[PDB]
Design a protein around this ligand. Structure first.
Ligand SMILES: O=C(O[C@@H]1Cc2c(O)cc(O)cc2O[C@@H]1c1cc(O)c(O)c(O)c1)c1cc(O)c(O)c(O)c1
Ligand SMILES: O=C(O[C@@H]1Cc2c(O)cc(O)cc2O[C@@H]1c1cc(O)c(O)c(O)c1)c1cc(O)c(O)c(O)c1
Ligand SMILES: O=C(O[C@@H]1Cc2c(O)cc(O)cc2O[C@@H]1c1cc(O)c(O)c(O)c1)c1cc(O)c(O)c(O)c1
Ligand SMILES: O=C(O[C@@H]1Cc2c(O)cc(O)cc2O[C@@H]1c1cc(O)c(O)c(O)c1)c1cc(O)c(O)c(O)c1
Ligand SMILES: O=C(O[C@@H]1Cc2c(O)cc(O)cc2O[C@@H]1c1cc(O)c(O)c(O)c1)c1cc(O)c(O)c(O)c1
Ligand SMILES: O=C(O[C@@H]1Cc2c(O)cc(O)cc2O[C@@H]1c1cc(O)c(O)c(O)c1)c1cc(O)c(O)c(O)c1
Lengths: 60, 60, 60, 60, 60, 60
């Protein structure tokens, strides 16, 4: 019974509760990368890169 | 019964509670990378890199 | 019964509670990398690098 | 300027986040009172009682 | 300027995050009172009682 | 400037994070009172009693 694998879980998020409460949020970039506020993110990859919250300035 | 593997878990997040409470958040980059506020992130990769909250300035 | 492996867990986070409470948070980079505020992050990788909260200035 | 009272707050709830996740919830009373699952409830009373999640068995 | 009282707060709840995660919750009373699961409740009373999560068996 | 009282706080709750995680919770009373799971509760009373999580068996 090759791979009779029952209920697995891979790359799962469940049961999250969040409260963000600012008064003056502010972002100001010049020529670069910015990544904020990522929340409750899942993923599964096969035979490939798997970045999630990446941020790169230049590439040459 | 090759790999009769029952309920595994791989790259799982569950049961998170968060309260962020600022008054003046502020981000200001010039030519670089910034990554903030990542929360409750899961992932599974097969045969590939697996960065999550990466940040790189340049590449040459 | 090769690998009759029952309920494993690999790269799991569960049951986190957090309260951040600032008054003036501030980030200001120039040409480099910054990574803040990472929380409740899981991952599993097979045959590849596995960075999570990386930060690199340059690459040449 | 008798009672130039500016922006007060009295009996206020704001900024709530909740995740309930059961599999078999069950309630079974016989002749009594039950009160469950109350959430995010505000109130203001003037010259009178102010119960919110009360529960009484008998009165004679 | 009698009572130039600025932004007061009285009976306030704000910024709550909750995750309940059961598998078999169960309640079973016989002739009495039960009060569960109260969350994020505010109140203000003037000239009167102020119970919130009360529970009484009998009254005679 | 009688009572120029600025931003007071009275009976305030703010910035709570909670994670409850059971597998079999159970409550079973017979003729009495039970009060569980109270969380993040505020109140202000003037000229009156102020119970919050009370529980009484009988009254005669
Ligand atoms: O049956 C799946 O194939 C396995 C993976 C895989 C792959 O990635 C690329 C490829 O060229 C071949 C390949 O054969 C794998 C395999 C798994 C076995 O259990 C098996 O008996 C077999 O003959 C051969 C499978 C299903 C999936 O759902 C999965 O996520 C996964 O990673 C794999
Ligand atoms: O059955 C899966 O294949 C295994 C992994 C794998 C792979 O990655 C690339 C590839 O060329 C071949 C490959 O054969 C693996 C394998 C596992 C066995 O238990 C097995 O009996 C077999 O013949 C051969 C599997 C399923 C998956 O779901 C999984 O996540 C995984 O990593 C693997
Ligand atoms: O069955 C899985 O294969 C094992 C891993 C693996 C791999 O990584 C690359 C590859 O070329 C082959 C490979 O064979 C492994 C293997 C495991 C065994 O128990 C087995 O009997 C076998 O013949 C051979 C497996 C499943 C998985 O879910 C997993 O996460 C894992 O790391 C592995
Ligand atoms: O102006 C409000 O009257 C106050 C309360 C009150 C009451 O409860 C019953 C009653 O017979 C009389 C009464 O006079 C109160 C009062 C407050 C003063 O500041 C004042 O100068 C005055 O002459 C007299 C008021 C407004 C409200 O919005 C309020 O919530 C409150 O509790 C009260
Ligand atoms: O102005 C408010 O009246 C005050 C309270 C109060 C009451 O409870 C019953 C009552 O017979 C009279 C009464 O006079 C109070 C009062 C407060 C003063 O600052 C004042 O100068 C005055 O003459 C007299 C007031 C407003 C409110 O919003 C409030 O919540 C409060 O408790 C009170
Ligand atoms: O102005 C408020 O009145 C005060 C309280 C109070 C009361 O409780 C019952 C009552 O018969 C009279 C009464 O006079 C109080 C009072 C406070 C003063 O600062 C004042 O100059 C005055 O003349 C007289 C007040 C406002 C409120 O918001 C409050 O919460 C409070 O407790 C009180």
């Amino acid at each position: 019974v090759l791979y009779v694998g029952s209920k697995t879980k891979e790359g799962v998020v469940h049961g999250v509760a969040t409260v963000a409460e600012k008064t003056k949020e502010q972002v100001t970039n010049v020529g670069g990368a910015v990544v904020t506020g990522v929340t409750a993110v899942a993923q599964k990859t096969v035979e490939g890169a798997g970045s999630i919250a990446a941020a790169t300035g230049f590439v040459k």
